[PDB]
């Protein structure tokens, strides 16, 4: 047997990823939850988000193309 | 199935506040199915949002549309890739005349490259390639409705991702050489995730393997569907408790660096290994250290030996195993025998290494994954 040898190539980087390589999404459909404000307001959640910093947060999903901005909405 | 919905200046502010105060950079997807009389993008709504966001001083990157490939099926509207390129050109003009004239723009967020999606991506890039800073596509391995536990453990399932990636790069390199390529939205299985699978320890083989392959094959950025939400592929559950994949992600953030190297096993499928330079923001480690990570999908423990000149280096183990009794279907995970759980609502726990005897073999139990940091490795490429 169960003893395996590893070969390592270390002469140069083969690629460079973003410092943000591991990023996260919020589905756009989450904004149709009455409780959106509470959810993203959670300090507990923010703590968990802080841990993955630095990172992109992509707000998008199927619902992306079914959302209309309304600057008067309650 | 899907109908129009409006969203408020409040909602914008919640979303941006969440990103901003969490140290995250926000990408907002705009509605691409607002059309004109000649099937051209009607930009007036976005203009409203663009203006509002400038006034409030929000530093935001943009996307336009999501999976345009499924527009006909989901809205009875067909937009070809040419047109969509033109539409991205039109949005670019609007950004360059705004307060954030340098605002980043990414697209087109097409599904994984089957024959239909390849043509759309190619024509999209021939037309709009000029103005996108990154190419976004999405990937899922399986239908969450039908996906099995075996599927999640299966190396032949993991391997399909490889051809997906090759196909994206074949289109990109034939139309916009050197454009950065991002996974725009990705996870285990589609339709919200596989029930009792996508939120477990078992989900981590697909997540960590995706990361290793993506880095190795030249993907610059990977975006995990979803941080939080209704789908069981979420990193964090409805009680704001973190699932195994959150802890896997956090480990990866802290240990794994931006410079991607390569590792492989003499006699090459069920033992999968990745090698980067160690994250230099990690205070424990120093310039030139390596971070190995490894997945073991065999049913027995395996023992990995490091090559010269790394055989007698100090190694720090970071090994992940489910907290029983539900095994790989557990929603709880241990790091080197210690259960990982928030200290309080404001405080992530330390992630304690387990130092190994210098010169010792690297133990990797059946169905597990581990990081290993090779200290004082003095790899010139890492400095
Ligand atoms: C001891 C034994 O026979 N058990 C199974 C075996 O049937 C299988 O072929 C092998 C390789 O997958 O894995 C073992 O768990
Ligand atoms: C959403 O609104 C737009 C208005 O431009 C309309 O064209 C579209 O068909 C609507 N979608 C529906 C009715 O689901
Ligand atoms: C775009 O949509 C707006 C808002 O619904 C509408 O008033 C306007 O006439 C449309 N403009 C074009 C160019 O079709
Ligand atoms: C917005 O954020 C990026 C980093 O994510 C920064 O480099 C950029 O300069 C900011 N926008 C501007 C130009 O004000
Ligand atoms: C794409 O659609 C537009 C109209 O929306 C049409 O004018 C054009 O011919 C189509 N592109 C190609 C190359 O077929
Ligand atoms: O879980 C899925 O099937 C996803 C497909 N892509 C868009 C989305 O992230 O909204 C999800 O619907
Ligand atoms: O346990 C054996 C070893 O892990 C090699 O794969 C097949 C198994 O039978
Ligand atoms: Cl896809
Ligand atoms: Cl097309
Ligand atoms: Cl959601």
Author numbering:
A (entry chain B): 1 to 74
B (entry chain A): 159 to 426, 429 to 543
Article passage:
Siastatin B is a potent and effective iminosugar inhibitor of three diverse glycosidase classes, namely, sialidases, β-d-glucuronidases, and N-acetyl-glucosaminidases. Surprisingly, siastatin B also inhibits both β-glucuronidases and human heparanase, which cleave β-glucuronic acid residues but not sialic acid or N-acetylated sugars. Herein, we show through crystallographic analysis of protein-inhibitor complexes that siastatin B generates both a hemiaminal and a 3-geminal diol iminosugar (3-GDI) that are, rather than the parent compound, directly responsible for enzyme inhibition.
Structures of human heparanase soaked with 8 and 9 revealed interactions similar to those seen in the active site of AcGH79. The 3ax-OH in both the 8 and 9 structures is also within 3 Å of the εN of Gln383, however, as for His327 in the active site of AcGH79, this atom is positioned incorrectly to form a hydrogen bond with the axial-hydroxyl. The presence of two additional hydrogen bonds with the active site of HPSE may be able to compensate more fully for the desolvation of an additional hydroxyl in the geminal-diol containing inhibitors.
